[PDB]
């Protein structure tokens, strides 16, 4: 009897927790990008997508674009589950 209730309670909780944690990292990306990059009114907010076993080249590709622009020389927040 308690297994059916706890699985419904976990599905109510864990789906709301991941949506809140994604909203928490979005506020964390909203902050510290207004200070690193300038704020005339707002910053140019874009995002990215995960990568498998090629992130050593992705870090090399991102640092080449960011060293001329400007721990990283840009804004970054890891979110791995």
């Amino acid at each position: 009897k308690q297994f059916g209730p706890l699985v419904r309670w976990l599905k109510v909780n864990f789906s709301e927790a991941f949506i809140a944690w994604i909203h928490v990292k979005a506020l964390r990306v909203f902050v510290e990008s207004v200070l690193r990059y300038g704020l005339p009114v707002n910053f140019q907010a874009m995002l990215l997508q995960p990568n498998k076993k090629t992130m050593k080249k992705l870090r090399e590709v991102l640092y080449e674009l960011y060293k001329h622009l400007d721990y990283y020389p840009y804004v970054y927040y890891k979110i791995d589950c």
């Binding site: 300038g38 704020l39 005339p40 400007d70």
Partner: protein, 52 residues
């Protein structure tokens, strides 16, 4: 070169700090105005009702 960018980032910030505290007194100048007016009305009502 990048130092001249960070100058106008801060000058955008300090001017923004002057703006937002001006709006919170802009709201305060009308939030107290409609409640101070009814306060003197009620006491002048209580003065004019006793002499009535």
């Amino acid at each position: 070169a990048d130092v001249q960018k960070q100058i106008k980032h801060m000058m955008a910030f300090i001017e923004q700090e002057a703006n937002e505290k001006a709006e919170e007194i802009d709201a305060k100048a009308e939030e107290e105005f409609n409640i101070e007016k009814g306060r003197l009305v009620q006491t002048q009502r209580l003065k004019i009702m006793e002499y009535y």
